[PDB]
Structure 1
Amino acid sequence: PYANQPTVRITELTDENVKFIIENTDLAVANSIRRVFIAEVPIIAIDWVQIDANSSVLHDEFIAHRLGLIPLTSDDIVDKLQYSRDCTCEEFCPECSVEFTLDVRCNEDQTRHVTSRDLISNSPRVIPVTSRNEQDDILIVKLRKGQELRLRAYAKKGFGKEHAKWNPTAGVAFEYDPDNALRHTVYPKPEEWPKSEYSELDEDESQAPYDPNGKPERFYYNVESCGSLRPETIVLSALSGLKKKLSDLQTQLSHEIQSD
């Protein structure tokens, strides 16, 4: 009637992704962790734009949408910043937002690539990922001689439930039972299917013998980071966020039980 005692085994850790395995947990816990990776791990992203001048060939909403999708390093700052809902300030303040400025003008004859390097921030900790000290800079717009783009953005705290720009992942590979032992899939021709990278089967064997007493355990994860957070920071923040969702739910539950 009590909690699982999950174990963890990290099989790869780079700056780009983290590949790990959780054992002795329920499939619902594993999938809620997977979902929180995508939808409830907050990060910083541009969510307010003011175009002072845009002579480029892309209209204002195009530039704004494009700026919103630039990942901003959010590692230590996202926990400190507040949601503008919770901030007791006006529209903005440094406690709930980060100011960016962009001011580019193509005077020279070659096309000027307005890239994420031109997004200048007031906060040194929250900068475009590509601008962080290889991979090139994200391209915001190409400008022709005489074209000019001057804007002022504000980045906010949010998560992927509100908009995919606050999603920190560039793909969450999730898998379990690589050999189809639980038979949660039913291959019409099991020989036709390639083997999982996590499979432990000799090549003559297509799928594992059916396990009637089996349950999903040993979930394999590959959490790729878009750049804002480190992959391990994505996983840790996901676990913390899920735990705080449950804690808030329990607080409200206690108020409802005692009020009855």
Structure 2
Amino acid sequence: HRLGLIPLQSMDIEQLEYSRDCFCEDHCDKCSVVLTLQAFGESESTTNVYSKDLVIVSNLMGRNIGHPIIQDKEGNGVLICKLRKGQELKLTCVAKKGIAKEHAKWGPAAAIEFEYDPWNKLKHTDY
């Protein structure tokens, strides 16, 4: 779930294709971006698993896409999980083009401020 919510690079998303449109089996490089995640507890301290640990695997063939957004100051990004001493997390993510109408994870924006007539001169609101 929280992997799904991770903000990925969607700049050249328009020259990517919907998996439902592509004539491939399941998914391919023309519709989806595959990135792996391999983390393991090493030190005695808690080993954090961020979004930077995600590694693009599929062939991007030039398109700026898939790279997890990191606006974090330290450069880590979204905190995905926390591992102990001998805890391992190994998985593979297949990212596809989607509309935020289908799931809020594909939401390109957050909060949009919107206000008209700050004096109630139209009288659309009875205070």
CA distance in 2, matches of 1:163, 1:179: 37
Contact in 1 for aligned 2:8/2:65 (Cα 8 Å): no
1:167 matched to 2:107? The reply is yes
1:71 equivalenced with 2:71 (yes/no): no
Answer yes or no: is 1:109 the counterpart of 2:64: no
CA contact (8 A) 1:111 1:144 kept: yes
Residues of 1 paired with 2:97 and 2:30: CA distance?
Answer: 10
Question: Which TM-score applies when normalising by structure 2?
Answer: 0.89
Q: Distance between the aligned counterparts of 1:107 and 1:126, measured in 2?
A: 27
Task: Tell me what 2:65 maps to.
Answer: 125
Cα distance between partner residues in 2 of 1:99 and 1:131: 22
Pair 72,115 (structure 1): closer, same or farther in 2 beyond 3 Å: same
Distance in 1 between the 2:93 and 2:22 partners? 18
Given the superposition, is the C-alpha separation of residues 131 and 125 from structure 1 closer, same or farther in structure 2, using an over 3 Å criterion? farther
Q: Distance in 1 between matches of 2:3 and 2:118?
A: 39
Q: Is the 8 A contact 1:106 1:143 kept in 2?
A: yes
Question: 2 CA distance for matches of 1:177 and 1:92?
Answer: 49
| Alpha-carbon separation, structure 2, partners of 1:167 and 1:131 | 17
- Of Structure 1 and Structure 2, which has the larger fraction of its residues in strand? 1
Equivalent-residue separation in structure 1 for 2:56 and 2:80 (angstroms) = 16
TM-score (norm 1): 0.45
Corresponding residue number in structure 2 for 1:99: 34
Question: What stretches of structure 2 of length at least 5 have no aligned partner?
Answer: none
1:182 shift after superposition: 0.7
Contact 2:47–2:84 (CA under 8 A) maintained in structure 1: yes
Aligned to 2:121: 181
Q: Counting helix residues as a fraction of each chain, which structure ranks higher?
A: 1
Counterparts of 1:130-169 in structure 2, within 5 Å, are 130=70, 134=73, 136-169=76-109
Tell which deviates more after alignment, 119-128 or 142-151. Answer: 119-128
Tell me the distance in 1 between the aligned counterparts of 2:119 and 2:94.
48
The alignment covers a number of residue pairs equal to 121
**Rounded Cα–Cα distance in structure 2 between residues aligned with 1:91 and 1:177:** 50
Q: After TM superposition, what 4+ stretches of structure 1 lie above 4 angstroms from structure 2? A: none
CA deviation digits over 1:171-206, x for unaligned, max 9? 11111112211111111xxxxxxxxxxxxxxxxxxx
8 Å CA contact retained: 1:116, 1:137: yes
CA gap of 1:69–1:186, structure 2 versus 1, over 3 A, is same
Asked which structure has the greater CA Rg, the reply is 1
In 2, Cα distance between the equivalents of 1:159 and 1:87?
16
Matches within 5 A, 1:1-260: 65-76=1-12, 78-122=13-57, 123=60, 125-130=65-70, 134=73, 136-187=76-127
